[PDB]
Amino acid sequence: TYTVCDKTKFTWKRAPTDSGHDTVVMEVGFSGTRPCRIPVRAVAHGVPEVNVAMLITPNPTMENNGGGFIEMQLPPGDNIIYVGDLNHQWFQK
């Protein structure tokens, strides 16, 4: 089912982590859905008011090994990535 992948199909391989080049990465794994459109969003400090998912890699896809690595960020501050049903807070600094 290559398409908008269902929010609960991925898993926390690696929660939102500061990439290293001064941005954020997150790593997610699929259960079956092939090249999908990964609904990766982020909310400011566990508060879904404004989406803070300004994606350094704004076109993530899940493949034969899963979404893999993605890149997100928002001007230094509290972010958290809600990868569909997945989520994990972390102020990016």
| Residue-wise burial string across 33-63, b where 16 or more C-beta atoms lie within 10 A, e elsewhere | beebebbbbbbbeeeeeeebbebebeebbbe
Tokens of 54: 């300004």
DSSP secondary structure code for residue 34 in this structure: -
Tokens of 83: 């990868």
**Domain spans in the chain, listed from the N-terminal domain onward:** 1-93
User: Which technique?
Assistant: NMR
Instruction: Name the fold adopted by 1-93.
Output: Immunoglobulin-like (2.60.40)
Where are the extended beta strands (E) located within 11-76? 11-18, 24-29, 40-44, 47-51, 68-72
